[PDB]
A paper describes a structure:
To understand the mechanism in detail we determined the structure of CitS from the human pathogen Salmonella enterica by single-wavelength anomalous dispersion with crystals of seleno-methionine derivatized protein. In membrane vesicles and proteoliposomes, CitS from Klebsiella pneumoniae (KpCitS) was previously shown to transport citrate as HCit2- in a sodium-dependent manner. We observed similar transport properties for CitS from Salmonella enterica (SeCitS), which is closely related to KpCitS. Sodium transport is cooperative with a Hill coefficient of 1.89, whereas citrate is not, suggesting that citrate transport is coupled to at least two Na+ ions.
The asymmetric unit contains two homodimers of two protomers in different conformations. Each protomer has 13 helix elements (H1–H13), including eleven transmembrane helices (TMH) and two helix hairpins (H6, H12), with the N-terminus on the cytoplasmic side and the C-terminus on the outside. Helices H2-–7 and H8–13 are organized in two repeats with inverted topology, connected by a flexible cytoplasmic loop. Together, helices H5–7 of repeat 1 and H11–13 of repeat 2 form a bundle on either side of the central contact domains, which hold the dimer together through extensive hydrophobic interactions of H2, 4, 8 and 10. The two dimers in the asymmetric unit are similar, with an overall rmsd of 0.5 Å, whereas the protomers within one dimer differ substantially by an rmsd of 8.4 Å. Evidently, the whole bundle moves as a rigid body from its position in protomer A to that in protomer B, while the central dimer contact domain remains static. We conclude that protomer A is outward-facing and that protomer B faces inward. All four protomers show clear electron density for citrate in the binding site. In the outward-facing protomers, the citrate is closely coordinated by two arginines (Arg402, Arg428), two polar sidechains (Asn186, Ser405) and the protein backbone of both hairpins. In both outward-facing protomers, two Na+ ions are clearly resolved next to the citrate. In the case of SeCitS, comparison of the inward-facing protomers B and B’ indicates unambiguously that citrate is released before Na+, and that Na2 is released before Na1.
Residue numbers in the entry:
A (entry chain C): 13 to 251, 257 to 445
B (entry chain D): 15 to 448
Write the structure that this text describes.
């Protein structure tokens, strides 16, 4: 009464005959057009589909190194499946339930931020942030100048370059970027929001792709020129030590802390402190500060801090490929890229991203940060689109541990862009 | 004084929990909370934590009623009844439970983790003796339940649905909860009317399963031929462990258990909806198909022992770290307080006790015929079915001083518990057909 025994070769921990069973199930669901629009239905598809295009992206000879590898193959194959029509409407719905309705994206980011920040030493927190802010500024200045120089060459005035190209790309992505950008444009120029948003969303999305490619490239550069890489680390020589016994309970507390620290940040940002100075504070920017305060407070035992890291490790190593399926489906839209895929737009955007890379490399190097991780966090993770872009880039360069800096770039840096945007939109 | 701040609420030291509690209070009074997985889990973690810890430390509650999970769903139901929850808080819990369907995932994980945790060889050996002995206990509990039900003027369909099947089910979250979904899927009636009655009868029966366990031991000493004190069979002559070599255990294997849980559900879902939506006139619910599927997956040997252990680890995480979250949801979506109180009847106590008796009569007879000792059989295949899942097994075996039979009680709670889900689907469907 035995069909088989386990084979040798594994796909996502699953030997071929076992993965076959899973794949067949997904094929049955597909052809019979039957899948629950749930976490169960979503995760079922996302796991199985993520598993196959992950192992392929991990083994594709030229692709794995200079393109982001496994997560980028998944990210692109899934985006293609939507564009082509290979996905059922309800398969799309199932993935959308997970990523947007259930908000697995926010859960994913919140778990990672909590694991990253609670794992660091208290004395190290405030100093990193103080050195990270001017590093962001250099990336903006770098992205601006490169976009202007490439702008005038194509016969593009300064305004169109800053308003339609630089700011959307360097802004906080979609919801907290192109959308409030679309407001200010309409709230000043008086034109339609759609004419700005449609252009902005298409431009920054192209730049997002380049930021993903460049991330994989900068990872290679850092192995070629070791002196430039922190090999994951951003701060020079930086990371209660008593790693006690660790139970499932302490890992569960990590999820308690991740969701609770988000909840507090949500309340503060939506009801208590929506804007400090002229700058608005996204709830993920508030969450970074809250987790930092929770670290500095001393309220978390090192076994609980270890639990938050262990959960963050489960997510980033076991649910990453699932997430990339959802991000490829929900936050790409290949058509909007192609409808704007003018090799004038491609060049301006790509150069602007390079401008952010160069500026942030220069900035952090002056600060005392590693040149490679400076251009990825304060450069690429500004020129990408929000948290979805942060997870694409950091997975492509295999630096998911830098999620907190990336979020400071996406949220706090994107809010800074908003201020600049309000000015540039006003004067001219 | 400093002794106090060392006290833990769900793994959180008292000052750290206060932070989490203050956070929930601020969200409540500013009326601000995301109605997604983040806001929901935060609410359900914090709320489940405090009332779970209170539930554990109330004497009659922990020993008789069910402790933490019971206190949680009762209090969460009270928050709805008394309008303590805001609308957003109710939306957040409901969205997690039904819209995101964290309930199906939870049940999918439990079923997968429980059945795959079973040794393959032991699984097949059970089909020749121990599983039939389990079936006899269900038949026994059925016959006794119908009769006592009749004497009280309770129809057969209600006795089977609200009394017998929950009692012989795999407890609360592994029995009454998935039984409510199957009921609602076949009947069309609210799951709240099923669960609220089922969980009360469950709790009463579990008490009698413990009391009878002690009695069966006292009987086993007086009638020594019934006992074979300690052992179930007559040949093995050694109890400790016989294993499948499980070595490495990483996050990858537990994540595979998540793949298997979510994929085995998908297969059971397609079968129930598009492939085999009705064998006979009987519609088999996907929870029932999943039991058969997951049991089959174990039989095929396709899964490595390291992956089986990964499924069990994920199952253990959900059942010990996420159960208190689920019970907040259970109280909000499955609980009618009046239906529970109305079920707390001396009549229901009597019916419950006799159903449990029927389980020990059925399992003794059927076990006597197969080659098992009557006393132990009635304890392992009778009482450890009639009790409240794994927690009940520990209470029952403690009362009869037979913790060595724990492997057999595990088969009852897991295999026989999923089998009840299959029987229930078949029985529920047959009852609505005219
Ligand atoms: C390995 C995958 C085998 C797939 C076999 C099932 C093929 C689908 O089967 C059919 O799909 C039709 C839609 O095209 C439906 O209308 C039918 O109800 C269904 O039977
Ligand atoms: C306001 C507080 C700012 C927090 C900055 C991010 C800290 C969490 O990020 C951590 O940074 C560490 C050193 O910087 C690195 O060693 C870790 O890999 C990274 O996870
Ligand atoms: C007499 C009018 C019909 C009965 C109205 C009261 C029904 C219960 O309604 C309300 O339930 C909640 C729980 O106590 C509380 O908010 C109120 O005290 C109670 O009035
Ligand atoms: C939707 C919640 C995802 C569950 C993740 C469980 C992580 C358990 C880690 C066990 C080592
Ligand atoms: Cl709100
Ligand atoms: Cl309200
Ligand atoms: Na951006
Ligand atoms: Na970003
Ligand atoms: Na039971
Ligand atoms: Na049991």
């Amino acid at each position: 009464k035995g069909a088989s025994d386990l084979l040798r070769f594994k796909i996502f921990g699953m030997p071929l005959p076992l993965y076959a069973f899973a794949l067949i199930t997904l094929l049955l669901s597909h052809f019979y057009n039957a899948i629950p629009t749930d976490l169960v239905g979503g995760f079922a598809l996302m796991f199985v589909m993520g598993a196959i295009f992950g192992e392929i992206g991990k083994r594709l000879p030229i692709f794995n190194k200079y393109i982001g590898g496994a997560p980028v193959m998944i990210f692109l194959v899934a985006a293609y499946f939507v564009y082509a029509g290979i996905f059922t409407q309800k398969e799309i719905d199932a993935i959308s339930n997970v990523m947007d309705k259930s908000n697995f994206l926010n859960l994913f980011i919140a778990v990672l931020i909590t694991g990253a920040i609670l794992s660091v030493n208290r004395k190290l927190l405030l100093k990193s942030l103080l050195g990270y802010i001017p590093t962001i500024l250099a990336g903006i200045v770098g992205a601006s100048l490169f976009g202007i120089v490439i702008g005038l060459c194509f016969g593009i005035p300064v305004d169109r370059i800053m308003m339609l190209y630089v700011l959307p790309i360097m802004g906080g992505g979609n919801g907290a970027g192109a959308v409030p950008l679309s407001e200010i444009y309409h709230s000043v120029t008086g034109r339609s929001r759609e004419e700005y948003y449609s252009t902005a969303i298409a431009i920054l999305t192209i730049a997002n792709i380049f930021a993903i490619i460049f991330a994989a490239l900068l990872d290679m550069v850092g192995k070629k020129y070791t002196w430039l890489s922190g090999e994951g680390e951003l701060v020079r020589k930086a990371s209660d030590e008593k790693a006690g016994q660790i139970t499932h309970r302490e890992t569960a507390v990590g999820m308690v802390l991740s969701t609770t620290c988000f909840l507090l940040a949500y309340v503060v940002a939506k009801k208590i402190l929506p804007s400090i100075g002229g700058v608005s504070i996204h709830y993920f920017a508030w969450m970074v500060l809250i987790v930092a305060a929770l670290n500095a407070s001393g309220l978390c035992s090192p076994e609980i801090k270890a639990g938050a890291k262990r959960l963050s490790d489960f997510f980033s190593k076991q649910l990453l490929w699932v997430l990339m399926v959802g991000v490829g489906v929900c936050y790409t839209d290949l058509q909007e890229i192609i409808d704007a895929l003018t090799f004038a737009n491609v060049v301006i955007a790509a150069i602007i991203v390079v401008g952010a890379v160069v500026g942030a490399a220069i900035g952090g190097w002056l600060i005392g940060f590693y040149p490679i991780e400076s251009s990825i966090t304060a450069g690429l993770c500004m020129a990408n689109r929000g948290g979805s872009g942060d997870l694409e880039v950091l997975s492509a360069c295999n630096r998911m541990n830098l999620i907190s800096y990336a979020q400071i770039s996406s949220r706090l840096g994107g809010g800074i862009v908003l201020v600049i945007a309000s000015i540039v939109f006003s004067m001219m």
